[model samples]
Target chain A: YKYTVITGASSGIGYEAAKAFAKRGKNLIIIARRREKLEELKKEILHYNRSLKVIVKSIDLSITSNVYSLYDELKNYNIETLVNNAGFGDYSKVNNQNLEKVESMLSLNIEALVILSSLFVRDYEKIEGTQLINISSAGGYTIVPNAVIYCATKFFVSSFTEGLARELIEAKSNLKAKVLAPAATETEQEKFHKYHTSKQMAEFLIKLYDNDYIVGKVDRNSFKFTLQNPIFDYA
Target chain B: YKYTVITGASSGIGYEAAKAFAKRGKNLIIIARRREKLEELKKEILHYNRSLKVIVKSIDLSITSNVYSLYDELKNYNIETLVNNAGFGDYSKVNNQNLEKVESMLSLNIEALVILSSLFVRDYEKIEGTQLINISSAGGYTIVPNAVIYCATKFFVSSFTEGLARELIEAKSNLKAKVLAPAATETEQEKFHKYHTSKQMAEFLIKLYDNDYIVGKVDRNSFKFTLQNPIFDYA
Candidate 1:
């Protein structure tokens, strides 16, 4: 049976995406660093569809070793959808931000992403119904003041996913590559400028899967399939 | 003496930029991996302005250890501008590209740029005339088909630099952060795409220093100070 895999599934968007997928009768392979949260997510997802299978892995994808091992384990499952959503941000000035934290952020956000995406593309390019959904932010499109490095990481997400989509298109392949850039969502961040809820974001993802939108662009608020890199037109 | 530091300064835009800065009476600290090339470049720049100081450091910055150590050495002198132009690319698809080459590309293109930018921002934010100019590509603003990962790295350059500039503007800091995204210039890349020359790129950077253009925005073929990400209107 084919399954949908969601990273950062312990909380927030990943967790919501897992629940939504399960509700839609899709089996899930949810991943995160916390075992307890994974267990909770698995239980809650089962509540949505008891017959749907939900597997959980408590591995930190930020670690290179863990990323490869997770990939190895995932090869056992027939994965149809890959949701790359495990990323976080530090809210300090670039200089004052901890170097270790920055390094970890890069590893998780950029390095792990490229590796996993490349591997999946290699393995699944010939498979129909296979899709790659990378979670970016509004920051990916527009630079935010305090979140310089974080935004840069998201920028990579937007560009890489879009570029890969173009490649698949050029090759006339069935595998779809998509990027989702949500605005300031109601998540862990305090002083919420008030965007979508986790449930709302999850529902939107499901809606996105139904649409014939091109990959590498963003879906904001609802399912508004907006093209990113309008600047690309000038180029 | 205050110096304009340029990476990948042995050839192309970096070499031309070094000469342009020297013509304007700025001392230089040019860095590249080739010692012989740097020596030759040093001679040519000195001919333009005999009184200008030109120091060359031949270090491979893709080695993680070399980045910070170079920053340590750079602290002894007053660095007025930093031109990050040390990245390279591979033309193969993501699946077919060598992992080692991709890793090195990421190390030089993304990681090295971030560390240097952060360090310089920390050390130079209070200095009145300090600036950081990151050399990006038109590809940064758009996603190209064959060079997906390479374009992603450049996207990071654009977003990170622009975000930092916004941060400074918000805080009313003296430090200036800028990005120059040139069109397909006469580099080692095969197949001529119509774009600016290395000399034109250099002259534009000089004009950027004198004008009020936003980061992540470029006016190719010549110097044009067009506003990019014009949220300054909101401010």
Candidate 2:
């Protein structure tokens, strides 16, 4: 009966993330920047003959100012599963990187996403079996030169998420947070032209997904999915 | 006197680093895309010392198409020290991060920086004493959510730099690469109109710099300064 919520569902990884969760018949709420794209995604999910609940919202995550309001409005739905996926990128050296574009992106990925995760975790801590899934990138592992600050931000997310996961676990809260550091995957995010998102990235992503080590950690005896785990580490 | 080259020298950490090296009377090659600003900075540096040698170049790091040629051009310089200090960031998710931007940024940070560092090591391998200074962030420690992929790049830098350092040591190469990860500082990168960059960040960065326990290992005798001696044994 619990609902799963995902962001950045308009296209690419967000769109695919929506599909991955939907096939499980999990109730779904998808958020993205465009209403048309979201509606289309909703229809596509319904076409799969799965009776899972699906809802769509169109809001730009870059609007850091109003993100709290949006979070408040959405918290009323009582999402059991939260997927923090909404984000965008623009590349330029710190001096040359467009300030407005950087701010907008930060609003969604860092500000809003962090806010949403906090809200759900607080709510779900009292309830059993609630989970938070963060789709981070394997690239977060390195401090890139030109992408310098961008690399820093990703490093922040990964470190933050891992620390958050440990905190929840140490607190003995039933809620769980798993930070997914996927290598370049076959998704639109990969195609975003940040660093030549190639077919190689997609193959890598699928391999990451298909791996036993990565999936085994996600699947459980109670939360069992029949997906076979692969034997490789995603890193 | 040996030449010390610093990239992203227009402002912020790079600018600060430029002065950090220049104060020691090291010959300087300052790289950034701002021609006018480069000239102005050079003027300021000359005012600091009338006899100091300063070379300024304006180039876009994110534009990867010219990376090899750029390195090739700079290879003729007898650089005894290299400071890889240029980077970019847009606080957006992987999917929404612009494709071209990400690619270009990676080119500058990952490709260009690495290429330049390799050339420096190759050419100056026999120099009595040479140092490679890499600026990373504490953010390199974990996988970040919003900046996940971006973080991966920094993590890579930290790891690669460390690994490269170890490799050089194992081979007993005189070349040394020092990866510097400051937590947060008062810099142009911290200024975002929409995002409130916290003093907490600066505090975190400076504190990390000041703290002994937080740093990994490096040879105290090999370099003039080191963050830590890699003695914590986090393992």
Q: Whole-model Cα lDDT per candidate?
A: 0.80, 0.58
Query: Residue B43 in model 2: shift from native, Å?
Result: 28
Q: Candidate 1: deviation at residue B134, Å?
A: 0.8
Model 1 CAPRI rating: acceptable
**Candidate 2 residues A177-212, lDDT tens each?**
666554433342434334313333223333434342
Q: Model 2 chain A, poorest ten-residue lDDT window?
A: A215-224
For B13-32, candidate 1 gives per-residue lDDT tens digits of 89898888888899999999
Give per-model TM-scores. Answer: 0.87, 0.49
Clash counts per candidate, in order, are 0, 59
Tell me the alpha-carbon RMSD of every candidate.
Answer: 3.6, 12.3
Write down the TM-score for model 2: 0.49
Docking class of 2: incorrect
How far out, in Å, is residue A216 in model 2? Answer: 9.8
